[PDB]
Write a protein that binds this DNA or RNA. Structure first.
Ligand SMILES: Nc1ncnc2c1ncn2[C@@H]1O[C@H](COP(=O)(O)OP(=O)(O)NP(=O)(O)O)[C@@H](O)[C@H]1O
Ligand SMILES: Nc1ncnc2c1ncn2[C@@H]1O[C@H](COP(=O)(O)OP(=O)(O)NP(=O)(O)O)[C@@H](O)[C@H]1O
Ligand SMILES: Nc1ncnc2c1ncn2[C@@H]1O[C@H](COP(=O)(O)OP(=O)(O)NP(=O)(O)O)[C@@H](O)[C@H]1O
Ligand SMILES: Nc1ncnc2c1ncn2[C@@H]1O[C@H](COP(=O)(O)OP(=O)(O)NP(=O)(O)O)[C@@H](O)[C@H]1O
Ligand SMILES: [Zn+2]
Ligand SMILES: [Zn+2]
Ligand SMILES: [Zn+2]
Ligand SMILES: [Zn+2]
Ligand SMILES: [Zn+2]
Ligand SMILES: [Zn+2]
Lengths: 703, 703
DNA sequence: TACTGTTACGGCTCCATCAGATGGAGCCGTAACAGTA
DNA sequence: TACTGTTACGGCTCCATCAGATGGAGCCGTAACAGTA
């Protein structure tokens, strides 16, 4: 009936004991960095998978990507668990829609088994010892599934090495097929593998459902066609029927990629299994979230238990049990602050999330909107990607929001066209802009700063000090001391990523890692330098009473007071304090940062640049993996930036960020190739007065 | 609440629909070959594992040993499943107790991580780049887990190639360590890996629980020592504390190996998982079975569902739901004959198992036992393995049974000493006997025939015709026809395992197998010869109106009438008919035979030999994987053999076979090194009069 | 003249894609040889 | 003289044991260069 966890002390959890009911919709809320992912994904999922993969093959456990055993006492009432984590990276030039969903492997098998080969020179059928066409004197090699893939030299096109593009233009030889001519002659139903991939998902499902095959080949392909049709049906049902299997995964949007990842791991139809979803609503519109909620309720109805760590209001309003962590974040949180039904969380004074839900704390909506001051910049002939020749004028000096469902072209319109043109005109960047006619009004701005929506990169060689750039100033200050000057030290001596002034027992890592072979690797503290990352010679040089280790092991609040007379350092630390990271250390490794904290570090990297008084701030979904309090702080700083006399445009699905905006531009009216038209454009009240778009309906519902 | 299976047509199932309750003890009874394994292991376990391993890593699914998708419509209420199958082979000279339970991998990791190397020439500690002792000028190689294993050239002893024995004697170099001298110098707590392996399990558990390690090494070994202790505790609790991790798996008994396999896959402590056990009581005494029943009830109490296909009366008397298949076997069965509680099966007239349980059918107990006729053969100084110098006289001309718990030395006493000495004296075999003084009374016998307890070998090149040896006579008869004589045909032309007279499109297999890569292979019928295994020239030669394909595609009952004037063929087919295989074809492949049918084929191979009127019949657990009806038939034929004037000794844990015996010899009083003494020796009533042995208690309880 | 932005180069880390090899035992078929009746 | 048992040799099949490699993107540190105030 219950999952009992006792003595959970993983990461920042303060030895908490929590009972999670089974066969229920249980959400884990709280601030960013409070211990939701560490409670669910790092502990419960890890134990549930570890206790089941041991009752399987011994050799195959190594390739499963095993998880380290959590620092817990005992877990009762556990069950096998499948989880979809909150960490997405993507951006691979060798991964497509076919390989991500694994349908391409099935297609390779199907073409290798029951395909019909030919000679690519005359088209006559090839028959056999040697599998060659006797007319053109060409010897085709053996037919195997590894010859229909572009990630090995056997089946990859020689010119582009299976990349597709070789000035970025399609490959002259394969024309984007990525496979050699020999492997493109095997046809099923009149099409080779590339042509079948180029077909839309909806078209391909019916192409495979209407295939005429001999009695011999149907026996072989019965176990392949059924799986292919099941996967295509999952993709269609999730709401992505307009995609093609040949699209690169480096071009998919956030919502499309998230839905692709969701549809793969959900359709198994099991029973008595715990499903763990970590932030399942990133880059998803309100209608996409409602569809996902319906699907998840259907999945629970089979007899499963759901543990979803969600920040959105809609998810918490459709659940039977809420577990709230906190009361703060980082080292200041990690306890079970409140529990129970959403009404109990609303009535619980100690729960910050309940305070926001109840209305005790809220994001202030301005009484009067900021009307445009007569300055507009206009774009005409927007035809990039799936934009159907629309023209929109973006105001200046006000807070602008760009809305619309996933695939409507919000990124393609704002990011590509606007940012690339502005950066080429003002920052003198060497970037190819999108397909458009012209932009009028560039002479009304001075600089452009953008925040992309891709997640940041993780590495043990980077911390907030290096990412924000303040570490360079700190190292210069340390190298400017009299003792460092008389010892010959430079700024490169004080960095743990440069050899010469770092602990050589760990190469500046600070902790040695012992390599197991079939078990997760272990991390143990260093012994030579005690984990200070530096030798004794470096640590002797002190500035204002602290050496570099002591200045790298101090929180942001402490470094704010420590660095007061230095303008650049104070400005950067003040921005870091403003975005919300007033409790994390100045040298915590990136790999140990939560998603929200990494996102806030990325925001503070760009929000700390000097403003010229008339600048362009382009933000692509800034409120991803952020609690309502972080959203409130971000809205406050953005509104202060606007009041300073600057123009800010924000592409957000968050309703609270939208409801405070000054001018809303809506793209739609549907996702994919069916959208690209400006549904509405005006003040939030005017857009709420329009019933053609779901965004207007939600805006008028909340107002 | 229920597992609903509809349209199950795998193997010989006749499209049955069955609902199996969840969180219950459900047994699947029926005859041998009726469709229990095909219903449970091949369908439910296959679907349950297939529907879960897809929600895991893609690469690691290949190494998991995937199961083919069953020929079923839809299964509802499924859940992830772990199963222990009924097919055990063992007999590997490169597998020990350590590797089977995987504790040896953990020990290799532990020794590679926190070991203490030395030089094997002087004993001084080795320190370093190269790990070498500067005194003896010896350079020890790198320390890795792959250097502590004898299955790779890095860590295997050169002399014996890691076999241990190089006239079978221990290796002169390693003295049975199987590892080279360099890898035997790494010691933990004063012992190398071989010494720790040689320690008993109970001793080693306390050796690891009382190890003094530095604070540095405890951090590394915390995740290893806990797992090692857990596995050792499982082995101790199952009832096998006397074993040592260095014992070869080719010497373990049936009960010990079965308990080792049971203890590994049960201790996971999950919930909402279906456990499938296929014949879990092979080679296990009554007390071992009672312990296993207690453990299984404890495992179900956690909230699991158990599907155990069992023939034993004890298992069916401790269950809440019985599913009975039949009503016959082979092509004559496959339907759900009866279902419900054990009382309902007792009162169900159509259930053969219920008929046997109720007492309508029973094994007749003779009114008066056959007293010995004054002829005895005596063995003195029995000290083989764990026999403590005991002497027993085995009577002649009566049915003798050897009882006792697993490890008591029943096999070591009867099989090794008696069979090897009798075969060396009478059959002129070149076999080394066991350790004993002498045997008096060999001149009272003429021949010895034995039936070992090891399972038979499976291959697609063998069928009952070839295994029983009747196929050679059939081929000779076919080659003796006038047309074959005039065509130059020989007996080697008529065998599908010899090239020249077989379908070259399949090399006599009869079905081509298409090789997938990450999916289970598919089997499709041949096209050139239509699966007749022979070409047109061979099939033209006909004997008595049938060619060789028609005589290879006929059941045993039909071939009994077809071959009536040939003495040898009729005798062999009559024996095959008597043992119970009157419905299977004469050419069904071995890989498709059930366990019980393969066992009966093995029995009929040896029971068909000519008896001299005074012969020795040694049977080692003949009633393994056989229903009560097959047991009744085997008891009948054995009693007829005894009445013919021969002596039969049977080493069986089956109580029905024991209760009909004429003279019982009991070994005990406990398993392992604590046994080897003759607890009781006399008629069944006399043994029942003794309360020192559990066998006597059971005998007096049933009588 | 210093601040701020860009671009290029080398080293380190992480994520996505890819779809088994080897050794020995058991069985079939065939030939050779001995005991027995 | 024929039946029955054992033993040796070559080919085919199955089970147990064993514990990742490669390619490209993102980040850090450093140098060079241009616009601006
Ligand atoms: N390996 C680690 N070592 C030390 N601290 C860690 C580690 N991993 C995470 N933390 C910290 O533990 C706290 C909780 O992190 P985590 O539980 O992953 O975040 P979360 O609550 O899911 N928040 P978010 O992902 O931003 O919504 C944060 O302060 C992290 O910086
Ligand atoms: N290079 C490309 N080639 C073809 N189609 C593309 C390409 N890049 C993007 N698309 C498609 O163009 C449509 C709009 O993409 P994009 O503008 O990035 O989405 P978006 O509106 O920002 N959605 P989201 O970020 O999820 O809220 C989607 O259907 C994309 O799959
Ligand atoms: N692959 C197969 N093709 C055809 N027939 C098969 C196949 N596998 C099994 N059978 C037959 O199907 C019947 C049931 O076999 P199976 O279900 O494995 O046995 P079982 O009921 O568990 N009996 P047993 O193992 O002896 O206790 C038998 O007649 C088998 O010979
Ligand atoms: N070669 C060997 N070296 C050491 N111990 C051995 C060896 N062979 C067997 N044993 C042990 O000797 C004991 C008796 O073995 P064995 O006589 O085969 O058992 P059994 O009584 O027939 N039991 P079971 O067949 O399971 O009913 C067991 O503890 C075996 O592990
Ligand atoms: Zn040609
Ligand atoms: Zn190309
Ligand atoms: Zn160090
Ligand atoms: Zn030495
Ligand atoms: Zn050796
Ligand atoms: Zn054929």
């Amino acid at each position: 009936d219950y999952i009992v966890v006792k003595g959970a002390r993983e990461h920042n959890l303060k030895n908490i004991d929590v009972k999670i009911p089974r066969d229920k919709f249980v959400v884990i809320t709280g601030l960013s960095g409070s211990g939701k992912s560490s409670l669910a994904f790092d502990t419960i999922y890890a134990e549930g998978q570890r206790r089941y993969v041991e009752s399987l093959s011994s050799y195959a456990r190594q390739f499963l990507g095993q998880m380290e055993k959590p620092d817990v006492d005992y877990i009762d009432g556990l069950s096998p668990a499948i989880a979809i984590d909150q960490k997405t990276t993507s951006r691979n030039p060798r991964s497509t829609v076919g390989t991500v969903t694994e349908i391409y492997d099935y297609l390779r098998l199907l073409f290798a088994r029951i395909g019909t080969p030919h000679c690519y020179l005359c088209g006559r059928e090839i028959s056999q010892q040697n599998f060659a066409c006797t007319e053109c004197n060409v010897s085709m090699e053996e037919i195997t599934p590894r010859m229909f893939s572009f990630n090995n030299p056997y089946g990859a096109c020689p010119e582009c090495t299976g990349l597709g593009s070789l000035s970025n233009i399609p490959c002259p030889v394969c024309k984007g097929a990525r496979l050699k001519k020999e492997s493109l002659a095997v046809t099923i139903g009149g099409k080779n593998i590339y042509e079948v991939c180029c077909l839309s998902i909806g078209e391909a499902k019916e192409f495979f459902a209407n295939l005429n095959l001999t009695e011999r080949q149907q026996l072989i392909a019965r176990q392949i066609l059924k799986e292919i049709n099941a996967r295509l049906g999952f993709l269609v049902d999730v709401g992505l029927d307009y995609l093609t299997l040949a699209r690169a995964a480096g071009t998919l949007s956030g919502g499309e990629a998230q839905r692709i990842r969701l549809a793969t791991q959900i359709g198994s139809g099991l029973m008595g299994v715990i499903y763990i979803l970590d932030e399942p609503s990133i880059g998803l519109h309100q209608r996409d979230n409602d569809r996902l909620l319906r699907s998840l309720k259907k999945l629970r109805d089979l007899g499963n238990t759901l543990l979803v760590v969600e920040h959105d209001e809609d998810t918490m309003y459709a659940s039977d049990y809420i577990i709230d962590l906190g009361p703060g974040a980082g080292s200041h949180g990690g306890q079970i602050v409140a529990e129970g039904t959403v009404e109990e969380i609303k009535q619980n004074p100690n729960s910050v999330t309940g305070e926001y839900l109840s209305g005790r704390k809220k994001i202030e909506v301005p009484k009067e909107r900021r009307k445009p001051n007569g300055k507009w910049l206009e774009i005409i002939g927007a035809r990039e990607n799936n934009l159907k020749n629309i023209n929109v004028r973006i105001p200046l000096g006000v807070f602008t929001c760009i809305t619309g469902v996933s695939g409507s072209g919000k990124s393609s319109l704002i990011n590509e066209i606007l940012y690339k043109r502005l950066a080429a005109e003002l920052n003198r960047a060497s970037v190819k802009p999108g397909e458009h006619d012209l932009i009028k009004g560039i002479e009304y701005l001075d600089k452009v700063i953008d925040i992309d929506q891709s997640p940041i990169g993780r590495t043990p060689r980077s911390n907030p000090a290096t990412y924000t750039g303040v570490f360079d100033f700190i190292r210069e200050i340390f190298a400017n001391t009299t003792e460092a000057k008389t010892r010959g030290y430079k700024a490169g001596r004080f960095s743990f990523n440069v050899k010469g002034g770092r602990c050589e027992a760990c190469a500046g890592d600070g902790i040695n890692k012992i390599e197991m072979h079939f078990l997760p690797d272990i991390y143990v503290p260093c012994e030579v330098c005690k984990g200070k990352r530096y030798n004794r010679e470096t640590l002797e040089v002190r500035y204002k009473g602290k050496n570099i280790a002591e200045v790298l092991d101090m929180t942001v609040e402490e470094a704010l007071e420590f660095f007061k007379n230095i303008p650049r350092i104070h400005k950067k630390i003040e921005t870091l304090y403003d975005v919300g990271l007033g409790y994390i250390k100045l040298g915590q490794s990136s790999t140990t940062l939560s998603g929200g904290e990494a996102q806030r570090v990325k925001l503070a990297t760009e929000l700390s640049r000097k403003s010229t008084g008339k600048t362009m701030y382009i933000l692509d979904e800034p409120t991803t993996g952020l609690h309502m309090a972080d959203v409130h702080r971000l809205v406050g700083i953005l509104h202060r930036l606007v009041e300073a006399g600057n123009s800010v445009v924000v592409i957000e699905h968050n309703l609270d960020v939208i409801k405070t905006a000054d001018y809303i531009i809506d793209l739609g009216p549907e996702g994919g190739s069916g959208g690209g038209l400006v549904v509405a454009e005006g003040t939030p009240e005017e857009v709420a007065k329009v019933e053609n778009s779901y965004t207007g309906q939600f805006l008028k519902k909340v107002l």
